Curated annotation (Swiss-Prot):
Residues 1-209 are annotated as: Interaction with NR3C1. Homodimer. Identified in NR3C1/GCR steroid receptor-chaperone complexes formed at least by NR3C1, HSP90AA1 and a variety of proteins containing TPR repeats such as FKBP4, FKBP5, PPID, PPP5C or STIP1. Forms a complex containing HSP90AA1, TSC1 and TSC2; TSC1 is required to recruit TCS2 to the complex. The closed form interacts (via the middle domain and TPR repeat-binding motif) with co-chaperone TSC1 (via C-terminus). Interacts with TOM34. Interacts with TERT; the interaction, together with PTGES3, is required for correct assembly and stabilization of the TERT holoenzyme complex. (Microbial infection) Interacts with herpes simplex virus 1 protein US11; this interaction inhibits TBK1-induced interferon production. Its main location: nucleus. ISGylated. The gene is HSP90AA1. The modification N6-acetyllysine is found at K43, K69. One of its GO terms (molecular function) is UTP binding. ATP binds at N36, D78, K97, F123. This is Heat shock protein HSP 90-alpha. The keyword Cell division does not apply. Keywords: Acetylation, ATP-binding, Cell membrane, Chaperone, Cytoplasm, Host-virus interaction, Hydrolase, Membrane, Mitochondrion, Nucleotide-binding, Nucleus, Phosphoprotein, S-nitrosylation, Stress response, Ubl conjugation. One of its GO terms (cellular component) is apical plasma membrane. It is found in: Nucleus; Cytoplasm; Melanosome; Cell membrane. One of its GO terms (biological process) is neuron migration.
Length: 209
């Protein structure tokens, strides 16, 4: 059972801008997704300070980076607070309408795409490198769901029957054919060291063989 939704017009506009603007500094997508993961981990940690049972779904607070050259995917896994179905539909838990408005005003006033995270819509930088993004998520208060979009104005939401995650979010980037550098260990390490040195959670880069 798959539900198909239209993006709000302003979010479709944001994604079109990200996909169509010539902008070479694509590597910032990883900083933005890791920052979202850190924010998610902060939220479940804060909730656990007064209610330890919030961590019954998993006590470990971490971020895993999983490249897969056979599938051409880069997956960013966190064990943060996750998102409900309602969160997924409401632009992955963002205030994306007002964030997009502020972002595009900043771009016409001299900003560049790398500042996207300052406007709370950093998730959508995934489309700098991905032709399709799948988000699997599990929040303590809801069931496990899969969101997916190849842009083009629509996204789908379905109950996920895949491997149970316990709690957290998995962002699966189906990379564009010319963006496979972001599956290479030395490239991912370089980006993490450059942009994510002060993230307060362990970031484990998985290797392949
Ligand atoms: O990288 C995009 C992304 C978006 C959301 C997300 O989970 C949450 C869920 C609730 C609050 C903060 C973060 N994790 C990754």
């Amino acid at each position: 059972e798959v539900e198909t939704f239209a993006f709000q017009a302003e979010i479709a506009q944001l994604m079109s801008l990200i996909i169509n603007t010539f902008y070479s500094n694509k590597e910032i997508f990883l900083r933005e997704l890791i920052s979202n993961s850190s924010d998610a981990l902060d939220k479940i940690r804060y909730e656990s300070l007064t209610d330890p049972s919030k961590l019954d779904s998993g006590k470990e607070l971490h971020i895993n980076l999983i490249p897969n050259k056979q599938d051409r995917t880069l997956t960013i896994v966190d064990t943060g607070i996750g998102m409900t179905k309602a969160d997924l539909i409401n632009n992955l838990g963002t205030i994306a309408k007002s964030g997009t408005k502020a972002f595009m005003e900043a771009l016409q006033a001299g900003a560049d795409i790398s500042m996207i995270g300052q406007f709370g819509v950093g998730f959508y930088s995934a489309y700098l490198v991905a032709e399709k993004v799948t988000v699997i998520t599990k929040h303590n208060d809801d069931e496990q769901y899969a969101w997916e979009s190849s842009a083009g104005g629509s996204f789908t939401v379905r109950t996920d029957t895949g491997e149970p995650m316990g709690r957290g979010t998995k962002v699966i980037l189906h990379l564009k054919e010319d963006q496979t550098e972001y599956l290479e260990e030395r490239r991912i390490k370089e980006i993490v060291k450059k942009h994510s040195q002060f993230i307060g959670y362990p970031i484990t880069l998985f290797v392949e063989k």
